[PDB]
């Protein structure tokens, strides 16, 4: 057994292809050796070494012992790999890093940082007598007995969470203690406050050890709730302040609305008012508020200005994950364009403080951002999409664009840029002038058959590379790469028409716009692009482009996508390079309103090109004086507030819209041009009415020797080939308290047989990225999970996959890691937290209810509605239960009215048992509030079943024995309520 | 440019995208044309009739009135309560992105409608040519340029 592996290792000890044998021998009980080798893209020798070591390793692993397996991993794991720099401990930031003038004697007092650390203070004196390294003095900040608690990132409302913690006793002698919890209103605990924070049960920690701590809680309210933990000992008392983040059920969905304020109609029609209506979505999670933020910035570039200059973050594309070098460049895009605006237009007086220091700060952030991509550069000055992966023609072109633009304000290394450009034109430019991709990275999915898709992708890549080379040409203006630019421009000129998509047509038009703008074929391409223009209004208020050609699809999209904004952006930049000022104003209005709170758009490419369009346009047109009186108020509610916007302040902070009324943003006679964006955040219970561009399936399994299996497959659009998707993202939300095995995920990306190209775990999400998801068959990520802490009433999680550059091509699915049913009953006490905020059915045929208590509860000013219904259908949707009922007799209506004998929907949290409703039975239901939805073309009302919702069973006949008397008093109340009007 | 002959013969239901899209009034010879007038389907196609919700703006107040359309080929008989209005779609773009209506009265007015989502610019321009031909020098109103 040892020799059978010594031969293997000895065979590949100094082999050229050595890693392929290593990760070939790695365990994969889900795929055969040939299936794993089918993904290898490093050549035949790597495939044969991989296949050999895979087969031999699989034969030796038959009927092994754990010692034999581990010893084999010792032989393989040492001789073949090299090393990797990593550290197991974190070291806090140093401090006291200052210089002082010491007049022979100087004392300075401060406060030691909050940490358990042996600090080392070092002084170095400099004077005309030389240097003096003083004796290093030690200062050990140490705590002998202390409590720490592990609070999860988020917790879904209604879940019963076990909060684990530990008390540490480093003293050599054991001791007594007790930890108590601080009761906050929204956090329901099984015990009850004594005096108001829990109880002290005295326990003992043994000397030089620890003791476990557990606190079971159940959050009833959404939001961030403070919880304190007190550790008491015969030597003192410590308070540990903590915060629990409670998240709603269901999926978060985010919609955006944009409005441009032009009070004097300088760039178009006058625009002084706009009304953002309050509309409740269909599947809104009950008892959750519809959030929406309002951002009113000063200029077309004002949103990006606020994004960069306000340092509370911030990424304009937080919904897209990091991992690709494209993300590292996009990190420096906004700072770059802000700097370009401030410097080219000389608008440094916007700062009320010293402008030179602000230009300094932005220059530094620009440089630091520019270093972020250095990791993705290879030795030959090429760039790889994925760190350690193969060099990409595409990403090298993009890096040459960003670097070439940044070089204007922060000079870039000319020799490096030269070597990169030469890497492009010397290797991956064909005779016909087009460029080819080296790696398997597919940034975009295009239409047509395999040959037609090949032509389209060739045109797109050539135009993209041309843009990069043009943007970085002045750094290294070589005749060789200018000749290359001539050949590529010729390819674009001859092969663009006839067009196959408005997208490739637009990017080709912009790439050619960066060169000779007098060539006749370029003018023909510009005409064909103008022919595809869509307009809103006549005379047009808006002008935009759909990425599909008209002759292939005549339908007009109702909402924007990333391809829409990217095509429109390429066309806008092409028109700006042509100085076509009559044509761009509706495009600028459309791109400005399609912008998003934060400054970004849908994906990365559309974002950068749209930012360049808005910024270049803002520098090309006259800067108007800014002076408006902007009033935001609700229609049928009080005025929210108003501010006077001037050039002094116009990047004002956002404002949350809490009230459930329609918003109205208005301004009087004004000078300037402001932007008003509203971001609506809701939480929905379903995803059925959303278009799914992926077949999804996900399960948890028990394994031999719990594991998540998440499979996706691409659904090709019309005229799309079966080759599969482009750059894809598999985002797996983990349930509360479920933790993923990071070793399995490493094993799926680190190898030559990698299934995924990058992975990360962020905020309870397992985010994997991928070059392509197949159309022919399913692709599955498989990784083990374990239970970190106990969770009762576990809320389901989400499984989302989407194209990185087309987030609109997505599919979201709910899943749970727990099989747990049944939910029959809660049995007595240890109960009040689950049944806390939902309804309790009255006692069946209970005659003690005294008809006046049935009227006073109905006439309560808190109780909005109150009437008698008959249930028609039961339904269980995800985490809630819907009851279809018929509205029989109306007894009260405070708010909106519903028609008699119309269909009324009820909803209760599935995790509520004592409100069990039987289909076909009548009930008297009285409660607070409702939801008014617009379904089909008519209204619909949905009523949640919570606490203070009085429900009672109501038989129709009178053969219930003594319930004859029951219905008598019931009909007594029913008769008295409507004849009075309390 | 191109040729503006589109959608022959003219069908009103086809000109209305079979009741799946909303249309906005962009040109009208009616001096009392409502500001920001947008028509959207308010129901399904039952028999030859079709519910149509009409939104518009008076001053700074938004208003909506329900109407019913009776479609007969190219002719449309719109009505609300007792008020009736006879119209005939006299031109419809090739992709049904815009159309030109002719409303009947002593001085028959001509209107131009287009998809609220937008339309192909060449087809929108063709509809504009047709309306300018029919109006024949009369003053045109632009209800969508009223700060909508």
């Amino acid at each position: 057994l040892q020799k059978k592996i010594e031969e293997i290792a000895a065979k590949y000890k100094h082999s050229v292809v050595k890693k392929c044998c290593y990760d070939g021998a790695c365990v994969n009980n889900d795929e055969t050796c040939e299936q794993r080798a089918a993904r290898i893209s490093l050549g035949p020798r790597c495939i044969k070494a991989f296949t050999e070591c895979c087969v031999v390793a699989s034969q030796l692993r038959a009927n092994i012992s754990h010692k034999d397996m581990q010893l084999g991993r010792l032989h393989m794991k040492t001789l073949l790999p090299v090393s990797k720099p990593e550290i197991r401990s974190y070291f806090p930031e140093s401090w006291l890093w200052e210089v002082h003038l010491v007049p022979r004697r100087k004392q300075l007092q401060f406060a030691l940082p909050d940490s358990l650390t042996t600090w080392e203070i070092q002084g170095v004196g400099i004077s005309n007598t030389g240097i003096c390294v003083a004796d290093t003095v030690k200062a050990k900040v140490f705590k002998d007995v202390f409590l720490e608690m592990n609070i999860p990132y988020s917790v879904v409302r209604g879940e019963q969470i076990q909060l684990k913690g530990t008390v540490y006793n480093y003293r050599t002698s054991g001791m007594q203690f007790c930890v108590k919890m601080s009761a906050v209103e929204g956090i329901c605990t099984s015990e009850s406050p004594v005096i108001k924070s829990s109880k002290c049960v005295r326990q003992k920690v043994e000397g030089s050890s620890s003791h476990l701590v557990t606190f079971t809680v159940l959050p009833l309210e959404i939001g961030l709730h403070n919880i304190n933990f007190s550790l008491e000992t015969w030597f003192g008392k410590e308070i540990l302040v903590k915060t629990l983040r409670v998240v709603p059920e269901g999926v978060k969905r985010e919609s955006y609305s944009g409005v441009t304020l032009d009070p004097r109609g300088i760039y178009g029609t006058i625009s002084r008012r706009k009304e953002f209506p309050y509309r409740i979505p269909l599947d809104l999670v009950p008892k959750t508020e519809i959030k929406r933020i309002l951002s009113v910035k000063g200029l077309l570039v004002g949103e990006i200005l606020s994004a960069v200059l306000s340092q509370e973050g911030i990424n304009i594309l937080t919904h897209l994950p990091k991992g690709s070098a494209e993300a590292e460049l996009m990190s420096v895009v906004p700072v770059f364009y802000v700097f370009h605006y401030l410097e080219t237009g000389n608008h440094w007086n916007i700062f009320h403080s010293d402008p030179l220091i602000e230009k300094q700060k932005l220059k530094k952030k620009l440089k630091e951002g520019m270093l972020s991509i250095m990791s993705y550069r290879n030795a030959d000055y090429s760039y790889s999409v994925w760190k350690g992966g193969s060099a990409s023609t595409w990403l090298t072109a993009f890096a040459l664009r960003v670097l070439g633009q940044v070089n204007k304000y922060v000079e870039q290394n000319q020799n490096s840029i030269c070597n990169s450009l030469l890497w492009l034109v010397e290797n991956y430019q064909l005779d016909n002038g087009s460029f080819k991709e080296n790696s398997q990275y597919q940034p975009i999915k295009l239409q047509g058959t395999l040959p037609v898709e090949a032509r389209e992708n060739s045109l797109y890549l050539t135009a993209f590379t041309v843009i990069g080379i043009r943007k970085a040409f002045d750094i290294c203006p070589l005749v060789k790469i200018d000749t290359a630019l001539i050949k590529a421009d010729n390819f674009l000129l001859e092969n663009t028409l006839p067009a196959q998509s408005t997208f490739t047509l637009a990017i080709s038009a912009y790439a050619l716009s960066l060169g000779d703008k007098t060539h006749p074929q370029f003018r023909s391409i510009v005409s064909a692009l103008k022919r595809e223009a869509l307009v809103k209004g006549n005379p047009p208020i808006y002008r935009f482009w759909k990425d599909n050609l008209q002759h292939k699809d005549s339908s007009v999209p109702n909402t924007g996508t990333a391809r829409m904004v990217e095509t429109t952006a390429y066309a806008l930049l092409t028109s700006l390079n042509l100085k076509d000022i009559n044509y761009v104003n509706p495009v600028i209005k459309w791109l400005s309103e399609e912008q998003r709170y934060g400054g970004g758009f849908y994906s990365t490419q559309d974002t950068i090109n749209a930012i360049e369009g808005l910024t270049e346009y803002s520098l090309l047109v006259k800067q108007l004086r800014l002076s408006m009186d902007i009033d935001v108020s609700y229609k049928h509610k009080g005025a929210l507030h108003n501010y006077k916007m001037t050039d002094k302040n116009f990047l004002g902070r956002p404002v949350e819209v809490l009230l459930n009324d329609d918003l109205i943003v208005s301004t009087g006679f004004g000078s300037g041009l402001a932007t008003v964006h509203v971001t609506t955040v809701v939480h929905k219970t379903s995803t059925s009415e959303e278009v799914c561009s992926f077949y999804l399936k996900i399960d948890t399994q028990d394994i031999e020797a719990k594991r998540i299996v998440a499979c996706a497959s691409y659904k090709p659009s019309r005229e799309e080939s079966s080759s599969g998707s482009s750059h894809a993202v598999m985002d797996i939300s983990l349930p509360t308290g479920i933790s993923a095995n990071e070793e399995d995920l490493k094993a799926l990306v680190e190898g030559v047989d990698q299934l995924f190209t990058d992975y990360q775990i962020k905020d309870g999400h397992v985010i994997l990225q991928l070059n392509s998801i197949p159309s022919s068959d399913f692709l599955c990520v498989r990784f083990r999970i374990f239970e970190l802490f106990e969770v009762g009433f576990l809320s389901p999680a989400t499984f989302t996959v989407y194209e990185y550059h087309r987030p609109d091509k997505q599919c979201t699915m709910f899943y749970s890691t727990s099989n747990i049913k049944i939910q029959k009953v809660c049995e007595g006490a240890a109960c009040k937290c689950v049944e806390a905020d939902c309804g309790q059915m009255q006692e069946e045929l209970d005659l003690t209810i005294s008809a006046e208590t049935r009227k006073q509860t109905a006439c309560k000013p808190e109780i909005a509605y109150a009437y008698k219904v008959s249930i028609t259908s039961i339904t269980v949707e995800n985490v809630f239960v819907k009851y279809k009922a018929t509205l029989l007799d109306i007894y009260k209506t405070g708010e909106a009215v519903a028609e008699k004998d119309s269909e009324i929907t009820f909803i209760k949290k599935v995790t509520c048992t004592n409100a069990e409703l039987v289909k076909g039975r009548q009930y008297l239901i009285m409660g607070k509030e409702a939801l008014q939805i617009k379904y089909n073309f008519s209204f619909r009302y949905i009523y949640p079943l919570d606490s203070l919702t009085w429900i009672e069973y109501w038989p129709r006949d009178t053969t219930c024995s003594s319930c004859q008397a029951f219905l008598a008093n019931l009909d007594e109340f029913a008769e008295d309520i409507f004849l009075n009007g309390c | 440019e191109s040729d503006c002959t589109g959608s022959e013969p003219v069908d009103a239901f086809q000109a209305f995208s079979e009741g799946k899209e909303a249309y906005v009034l962009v040109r009208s010879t009616d001096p009392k044309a409502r500001d920001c007038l947008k028509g959207e389907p308010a129901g399904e196609k039952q028999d030859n009739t079709l519910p149509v919700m009409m939104t518009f703006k008076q001053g700074t107040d938004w208003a909506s009135t329900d109407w019913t359309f009776t479609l007969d080929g190219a002719k449309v008989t719109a009505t609300l309560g007792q008020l009736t209005q006879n119209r005939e779609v006299v031109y419809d773009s090739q992709s049904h992105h815009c159309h030109v209506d002719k409303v009947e009265k002593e001085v028959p007015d001509y209107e131009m409608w287009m998809l609220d989502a937008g339309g192909l610019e060449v087809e929108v321009e063709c509809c504009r040519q047709k309306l300018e031909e029919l109006a024949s020098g009369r003053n045109q109103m632009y209800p969508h340029l009223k700060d909508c």
Binding site: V99, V124, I126, D135 | -
Partner: protein, 647 residues
């Protein structure tokens, strides 16, 4: 017979204040002399010059400080390599070709931590001194090179006080992991460079803590058959790991800098971690019978690399640990000479002071040392001396010897060994040495030595040196002459009267702060008459206490063995004079570093403990060039400074 002696550093340093000494003899009437640094070889341009007066009031000795201005030298393609040192007077005019270096000053790069994780910010400052160990106040350029050799950032800053604070270097969110290099340099005039290193490692969350504890830090002859190793492991919630699987692999390593190692698949012994502790024993002999080696005579100064993998049994999690290397030690002792020039003076007893240290380079006391020696005279007739034996002094670690050799001896090949009662003959320490006789055509020799070197010289005391010449022409020597050098600059010079009523006479030298941390003393007398004047010289190396010129001291009030988090505390700084002070507070756990006084005496152009094959070699090994009308026969191509010899 009249003579003149010009003493200068072996090399001229651009921008440095170079002190040039002139000492003339035989002249009774006063006269002036011009010392000059001019251009080579035309002497058209005068980089600098100074006038010195020589009189009876002056004892016919004077000094002049010259400076080669950096701006007076061309730049780039054909830079200056040599200058002319010239002395002109009524009596003589002599010049010499002197090499120049553009290395001036010191640039110490100080980063707050040596290891960083992503998104952290590197705090970095530079201490910049000139050749005279004073705030350089020169603008400085910092360059950052990543592990792939790419220059990724450069920033220059002017220097006001000698401490240069740079903006913090932000580590990228996803950086290039490995060894980063910082290079400091001056923007103008000079070629001085400073260099620091810092690693960027990726943080990985550990499941538990694994510790390896070897029996000793070195492997001697007693543990060559058995070496105990205790492997402990505990969870980070302060509980011992109950059960785990321990796998240990052993390797042989050349040096700790190189990450190369030779594994031994024979000693892959596996054990069980029970209740937190496991233990194994490594039979070095048997395992190193693999990979050749075989014996303990080999493996000496090589290392034993240890790798351990611990697989906890409950959750199946695995964590690794490693010991980089345990140096195999063949002898518990190492020998080195102290204050014993490897040069013989015929007629003077030759002293040898051996010094014994342990594996930690600590002075071991009470160690007997045996000294053997062979002698070769002018007739090539070899003689084996009788062995001598001393015992290591335990006050200073010294083991002293005094040797009486025949006057005709020329070469002394002496060998020293340790004589420990419990060590085999192989495990003893042995060192060989060869000493060559001072060569003089007039059989004239000089030997200086200052009472004795223990304890080290403290600034403020006095150095009572003994000057013993052995020669003919003894009672016609008028005076003795001396030059005191430190940090590559002649700090003192003078002449003492020779008493006709003794053989030796004590020359007293007050030890000053200019002499910290080391100095060199050159003493010489002039043998005159017919033929040609001869300089008879000797030199000694003076190790002086490392004492700051402006002493810094920091204290924490209150003083306590441990503090509590968030505690308000006062730091007291005290200096001898008004001084700038750069402070830092670093988590000591990063160190698992710098010493300036040793890197500072790289400017000492001298080598060895003193002495020389002849006069010119005595001046050369002291870091000096000289101009003389006397005999100046030196070795060949002797223009660059000496290089300290290693063994």
């Amino acid at each position: 017979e009249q003579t003149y002696v010009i003493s200068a550093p072996k090399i001229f340093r651009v921008g440095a204040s170079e002190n040039i000494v002139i000492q003339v003899y035989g002249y009774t009437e006063a006269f002036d002399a011009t010392i000059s640094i001019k251009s080579y070889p035309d002497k058209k341009f005068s980089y600098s010059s100074g006038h010195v007066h020589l009189s009876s009031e002056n004892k016919f000795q004077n000094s002049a400080i010259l400076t080669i201005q950096p701006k007076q030298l061309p730049g780039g393609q054909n830079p200056v390599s040599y200058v002319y040192l010239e002395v002109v007077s009524k009596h003589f005019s002599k010049s010499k070709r002197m090499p120049i270096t553009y290395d001036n000053g010191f640039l110490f790069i100080h980063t707050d931590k040596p290891v960083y994780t992503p998104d952290q910010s590197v705090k970095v400052r530079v201490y910049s001194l000139n050749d005279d160990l004073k705030p350089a106040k020169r603008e400085t350029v910092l360059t950052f090179i990543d592990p792939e050799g790419s220059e990724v950032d450069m920033v220059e800053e002017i220097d006001h006080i000698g401490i240069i604070s740079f903006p913090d270097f932000k580590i990228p969110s996803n950086p290039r992991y490995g060894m980063w290099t910082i290079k400091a340099k001056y923007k103008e005039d000079f070629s001085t460079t400073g260099t620091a290193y810092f690693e960027v490692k990726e943080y990985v969350l550990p499941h538990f803590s694994v510790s390896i504890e070897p029996e000793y830090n070195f492997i001697g002859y007693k543990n060559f058959k058995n070496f105990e190793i205790t492997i402990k492991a505990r969870y980070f919630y302060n509980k011992v790991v109950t059960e785990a699987d321990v796998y240990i692999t052993f390797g042989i390593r050349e040096d700790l800098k190189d990450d190369q190692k030779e594994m031994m698949q024979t000693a892959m012994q596996n054990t069980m971690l029970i209740n937190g502790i496991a233990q194994v024993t490594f039979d070095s002999e048997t395992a190193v019978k693999e990979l050749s080696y075989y014996s303990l005579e080999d493996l000496n100064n090589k290392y034993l690399y240890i790798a351990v993998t611990v697989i906890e049994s409950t959750g199946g999690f695995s964590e690794e640990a490693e010991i980089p290397g345990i140096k195999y030690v063949l002898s518990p002792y190492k020998l080195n000479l102290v204050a014993t020039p490897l040069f013989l003076k015929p007629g003077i007893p030759y002293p040898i002071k051996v010094q014994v240290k342990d594996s930690l380079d600590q002075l071991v006391g009470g160690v007997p040392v045996t000294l053997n020696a062979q002698t070769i005279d002018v007739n090539q007739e070899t003689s084996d001396l009788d062995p001598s034996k001393s015992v290591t002094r335990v006050d200073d670690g010294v083991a002293s010897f005094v040797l009486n050799l025949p006057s005709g001896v020329t070469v002394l090949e002496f060998n020293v060994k340790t004589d420990a009662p419990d060590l085999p003959e192989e495990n003893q320490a042995r060192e060989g040495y060869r000493a060559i006789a001072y060569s003089s055509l007039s059989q004239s020799y000089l030997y200086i030595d200052w009472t004795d070197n223990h304890k080290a010289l403290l600034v403020g005391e006095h150095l009572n040196i003994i000057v013993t010449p052995k020669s003919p022409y003894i009672d016609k020597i008028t005076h003795y002459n001396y030059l005191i050098l430190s940090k590559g600059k002649i700090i003192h010079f003078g002449t003492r009267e020779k008493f006709s009523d003794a053989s030796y006479q004590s020359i007293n030298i007050p030890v000053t702060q200019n002499m910290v941390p080391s100095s060199r003393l050159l003493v010489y007398y002039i043998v005159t008459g017919e033929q040609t004047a001869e300089l008879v010289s000797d030199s000694v190396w003076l190790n002086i206490e490392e004492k700051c010129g402006n002493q810094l001291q920091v204290h924490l009030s209150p003083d306590a063995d441990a503090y509590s988090p968030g505690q308000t505390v006062s730091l007291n700084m005290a200096t001898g004079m008004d001084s700038w002070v750069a402070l830092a507070a670093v988590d000591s756990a990063v160190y698992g570093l710098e010493r300036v006084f040793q890197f500072l005496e790289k400017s000492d152009l001298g080598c060895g403990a003193g002495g020389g094959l002849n006069n010119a070699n005595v001046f050369h090994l002291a870091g000096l060039t000289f101009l003389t009308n006397a005999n100046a026969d030196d070795s060949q191509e002797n223009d660059e400074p000496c290089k300290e010899i290693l063994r």
